[PDB]
């Protein structure tokens, strides 16, 4: 009985840690995604404007 209680406590704590790590990873990846998005938009519009004022 003691061993089973310990097993479920260990699962609870470890799985809590896993979920928290997943949330932090998602937050950092979202920041990277936003930076990439802004960079892509800027580069696209810059190239279009250069090709437009080329004439």
């Amino acid at each position: 009985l003691d061993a089973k209680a310990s097993e479920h406590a260990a699962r609870m704590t470890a799985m809590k840690n896993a979920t928290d790590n997943a949330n932090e990873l998602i937050r950092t990846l979202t920041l990277s995604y936003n930076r990439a998005r802004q960079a892509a938009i800027t580069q696209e519009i810059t190239e279009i404007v250069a090709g437009a004022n080329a004439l």
Partner: protein, 478 residues
């Protein structure tokens, strides 16, 4: 030597530039030698920029262009009902001349803030998943958004057919679709009998870009004539994204400063002009109202693109449709989570307002507790009942094509589901129960159906529960 003619300097890609026409108006309509129309957009210091509304290949440098003296306008009138016309008003169904007597300009000011009235009348779409969770009211403008081949056209056709008994005039605008698809739609409407109060405006994909760019404005111009005389008009746009693409083509070919994604500066101004002309008029002006249902195409579910974001900001509500949910048997496939309607409540009858309050919470609970559904079969207090009820809800939301359900029957079935009468019937028997319930009601529930239709309010609890229990006993469980 006159100021009312001109000679063409440059021809190519559906636009032209002319020397002369010193007295033309900005936005005027012009006529070429071979007979195709044109629009003056850019009035340079010494030349005029003209977009060509037709087959330009017959135009050569050096031929003559003439004034017409009219800002672009379209015919209006009750004669257009039942016809299929292009944005210039010329019929394409082949059934002879259209026989109009009146005209209305393409660009007219929207009703002022003091001429409008709060939305209070319901627009019955006939779809349970919409009339339950995402209300639409007369005067409201609602965005219907989804990926390609998800059912938007089917939803629009169902809505247009469902207005048969209402005192409403329906307008359908087709931008950038196959002529085969447009003809199939016209055949379906004539088959169901909706083509005696409907106007269809067509601008197919092979057509020049300006006709696509002008089609929705022709639609709103035709609708406003009925709206201002005291009637209710419903307008559907098939592809505002194709509208935007056509305008982008015109702008870039006229060499205006390109913005983000090569779109011109005033694309938001264009869509705001289009979607701010639908409103519910104040009583002093008249009882009329106009409601608009623009469509937007999502590339693989992306909703953050420039045009979709503009339209989402402009409109009053969203309905989201998903391919996977369509594949999962949810035929109308409304993702009730992130769809919304800002005019909810005032756009619903009393009975629907009473019966739809519980449904959203149950559906949200199912959607958020789905984590215990695929991996599950474990005892629990809520999820053992919450997921069980949510599955029944999702099964009830489903509907079959071209069979709009009256609002009273929607009320009755939603009441039955929300009161737990489905809690024992098998999930694959849920739809059978729904069909049997409508079939049972049409004969054994007149005192409920007519009571709802007359009072807009729920029947007596005793009688309603007695009838439901009688049918529930009559039911057969497979």
């Amino acid at each position: 030597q006159v100021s009312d003619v001109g000679t063409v300097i440059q021809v190519g890609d559906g636009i032209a530039r002319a020397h002369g026409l010193d007295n033309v108006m900005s936005g005027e309509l012009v006529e070429f030698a071979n007979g195709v129309m044109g629009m003056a957009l850019n009035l340079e210091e010494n030349n005029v920029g003209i977009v060509i509304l037709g087959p330009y290949t017959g135009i050569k440098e050096g031929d003559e262009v003439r004034r017409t003296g009219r800002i672009m306008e379209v015919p209006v009138g009750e004669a257009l009902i039942g016809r299929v016309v292009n944005p210039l008003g010329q019929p394409v169904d082949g059934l002879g001349p259209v026989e109009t007597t009146e005209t209305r300009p393409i660009e007219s000011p929207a009703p002022g803030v003091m001429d409008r009235r709060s939305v209070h009348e319901p627009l019955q779409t006939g779809i349970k998943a919409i009339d339950a969770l995402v209300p639409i009211g007369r005067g409201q403008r609602e965005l219907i958004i989804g990926d390609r081949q998800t059912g938007k056209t089917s939803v629009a056709i169902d809505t247009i057919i469902n207005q048969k008994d209402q005192n409403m005039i329906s307008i359908y605008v087709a931008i950038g679709q196959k002529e085969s698809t447009v003809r199939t739609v016209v055949e379906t409407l004539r088959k169901h009998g909706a083509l005696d109060y409907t106007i269809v405006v067509t601008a197919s994909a092979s057509q020049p870009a300006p006709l696509l760019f002008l089609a929705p404005y022709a639609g709103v111009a035709m609708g406003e004539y009925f709206m201002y005389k005291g009637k209710h008009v419903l307008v559907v746009y098939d592809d505002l994204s194709k509208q935007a693409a056509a305008y982008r083509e015109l702008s870039l070919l006229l060499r205006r400063p390109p913005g983000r994604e090569a779109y011109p500066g005033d694309i938001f101004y264009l869509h705001s002009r289009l979607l701010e002309r639908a409103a519910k008029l104040s009583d002093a002006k008249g009882g009329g109202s106009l409601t608009a249902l623009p469509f937007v195409e999502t590339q693989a579910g992306d909703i953050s693109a420039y045009i979709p974001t503009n339209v989402i900001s402009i409109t009053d509500g969203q309905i989201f449709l998903q391919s996977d949910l369509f594949f999962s048997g949810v035929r109308p496939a409304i993702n009730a989570g992130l769809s919304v309607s800002r005019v909810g409540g005032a756009a619903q009858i009393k009975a629907m307002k009473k019966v739809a309050g519980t449904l959203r919470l149950d559906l949200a609970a199912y959607r958020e507790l789905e984590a215990f559904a695929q991996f599950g079969s474990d005892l629990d207090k809520a999820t053992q009942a919450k997921l069980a009820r949510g599955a029944r809800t999702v099964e009830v939301l489903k509907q079959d094509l071209h069979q709009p359900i009256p609002v009273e029957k929607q009320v009755l079935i939603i009441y039955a589901l929300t009161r737990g009468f489905l809690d024992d019937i098998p999930v694959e028997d849920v739809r059978r129960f729904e069909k049997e319930f409508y079939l049972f009601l049409d004969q054994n529930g007149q005192h409920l159906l007519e009571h709802i239709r007359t009072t807009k309010d729920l029947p007596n609890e005793d009688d309603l529960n007695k009838a439901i229990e009688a049918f529930k006993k009559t039911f057969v469980v497979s």
